[PDB]
Amino acid sequence: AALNQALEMKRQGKREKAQKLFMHALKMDPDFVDALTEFGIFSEEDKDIIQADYLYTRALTISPYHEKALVNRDRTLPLVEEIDQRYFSIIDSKVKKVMSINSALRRVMEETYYHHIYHTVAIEGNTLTLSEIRHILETRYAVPGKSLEEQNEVIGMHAAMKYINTTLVSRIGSVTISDVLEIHRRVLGYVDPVEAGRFRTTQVLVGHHIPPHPQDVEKQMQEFVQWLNSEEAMNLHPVEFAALAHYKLVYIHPFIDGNGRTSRLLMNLILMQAGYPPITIRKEQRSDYYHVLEAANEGDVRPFIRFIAKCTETTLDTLLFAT
Amino acid sequence: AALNQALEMKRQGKREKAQKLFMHALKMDPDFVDALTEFGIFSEEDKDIIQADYLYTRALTISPYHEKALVNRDRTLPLVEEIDQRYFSIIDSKVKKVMSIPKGNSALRRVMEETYYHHIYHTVAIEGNTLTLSEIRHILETRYAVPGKSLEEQNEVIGMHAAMKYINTTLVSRIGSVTISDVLEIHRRVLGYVDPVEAGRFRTTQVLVGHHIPPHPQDVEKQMQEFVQWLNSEEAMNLHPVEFAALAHYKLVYIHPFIDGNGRTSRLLMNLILMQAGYPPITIRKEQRSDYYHVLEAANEGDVRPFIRFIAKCTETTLDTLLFATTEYSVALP
Ligand SMILES: Nc1ncnc2c1ncn2[C@@H]1O[C@H](COP(=O)(O)OP(=O)(O)O)[C@@H](O)[C@H]1O
Ligand SMILES: Nc1ncnc2c1ncn2[C@@H]1O[C@H](COP(=O)(O)OP(=O)(O)O)[C@@H](O)[C@H]1O
Ligand SMILES: [Mg+2]
Ligand SMILES: [Mg+2]
């Protein structure tokens, strides 16, 4: 198809030109095995083994026996497992330096705390500025010309964080379904006190994703918390555990609202319980954040795991910048 | 004691003077049987049989056999029961006038909206909420915050409206028993936007409320089961709607089941009882805070009649307003 033009293009370079044809052929058919497999060998020439591997894996989900994808995938499968293991051990070092450590650390933590709220709420259309958030929380006085729902999204954010940082981080034992609802009760309670702290009673669409039926939400959550307390989960790297817990909850979409915020908090609880600072997915990463969630729903949660790892690294880089 | 100075002073008039000595003797001892009886006799000379009766009723709670109180109390016990029965039948006529209006009527519809925001203004303002009626209309109509006012105050308003909506939609028209769950559902909305953890659940701690120590948090649940049993009893349905409402208001206030928002739920439950009997929702105005607490104090002390009467005067003033306002718009509106 358009693939052959990219292959001829690929020769003689104009690679930026070959990329567009590969990308266009992918838009016309994202399940085109020969385009995936050839675009992966293209991605490797640019030293992008992680993306090359993505495309060989997408290809073999569509065509399990495609020889060209197979011989490449066998090759990159564990090369990528190492590359990924390595990134995690790089994050661990930055965590050590941070946990090695004060005047300027304490100062950073606050600046950060209000910055987390600004980003967790802003990502989904909340128009409050960081100064307005600091105002709402410090003074307890409303902000002029801004909706009450927006300001109550902030109060609940702080109420929930307080509760986690005080009642759950230091606590020993199993993470319960009850804790998750307690987080949600605070997260959403000031905006919707009837729906906060209880599961979805209706079926919904979330982009192109239809989550479990409200009849199934409770079992899917019991299975989720079983997993959160499993050895399998505690044997993961905290970053991979956190990212998976974030995703798994988002996939269940147990509440009618405030799912993304509880997932980001649960993720930060998992991380903080493993001695990691709380991560912030910035407002500006919404497009990337949804692309990795889409690829995850499509079958590969690694880019989501990697997305959260780059968020983890950035958060630490920002902390160590105050050296 | 100082009673003898009033009594003598009372002779020769100088009543205003007499009153102060009676009031002072009452401040030094509110349980002085002879000062109560003499002051009741004094109150009748001014045509105040209801207050005279209060004083003889009070005296006989302290001294069951006091002859002077006793003979007066028989005279007045049932006079006052008639006077009270009569006021209620006067209120019924005014309700008939309100409920004799076509109800799609343009003038009333304006008054019903005005009264709604005015109720919220007063039910919240009575406990120090500084929001003005215009700020309340703003918060609810626009959904935008009000500058320079606390978020707690604006969330007290959102929860009142949320609760009133729920009552007016889900409970007024509903048939059957009023349950303990409905009361919590009201509270969930009333308080949820201010305290989402405590809203919809009973007190877990013991508290003081003025000079009143309510049931222990261990006892709150049984006291509420007894309360809703009473709300569904025929004894309660045989009362006049006004007396039933006022008693339900008081009984809940006495239990004080929640850590906050008790007064508001009681005023709402009171308005549910009334609305279920075909009465418009009444408003205890913020300017009546002092009187409202005095009648609750007298109730706690042993006599709930002044509280019942207080709510009846609120019922009458609400209707009077409604009728007058619906009549002013009948002319000046098209
Ligand atoms: N296609 C999708 N697949 C899976 N999860 C999704 C998808 N689209 C959105 N989400 C998730 O839904 C969240 C937004 O839903 P919502 O329940 O209203 O949470 P909140 O109120 O915290 O923003 C996003 O943050 C994301 O985590
Ligand atoms: N001494 C008292 N005796 C009986 N009830 C009282 C007393 N003091 C206060 N109350 C009741 O308590 C209410 C105020 O308490 P609260 O639980 O905080 O409710 P809210 O915040 O809605 O007003 C008053 O409206 C009144 O009904
Ligand atoms: Mg949302
Ligand atoms: Mg109060």
Residue numbers in the entry:
A (entry chain B): 108 to 208, 212 to 433
B (entry chain A): 108 to 441
According to the publication:
AMPylation (or adenylylation) is the transfer of AMP from ATP to a Tyr or Thr/Ser residue in target proteins. Interestingly, in eukaryotic genomes only one FIC-domain containing protein has been identified to date, HYPE or FICD, and it is strongly conserved from C. elegans to humans. Here we describe the first crystal structure of a eukaryotic HYPE encompassing the two TPR-motifs, an α-helical linker, and the FIC domain of the human protein. We demonstrate that HYPE forms stable dimers with structurally and functionally integrated FIC-domains and with TPR-motifs exposed for protein-protein interactions.
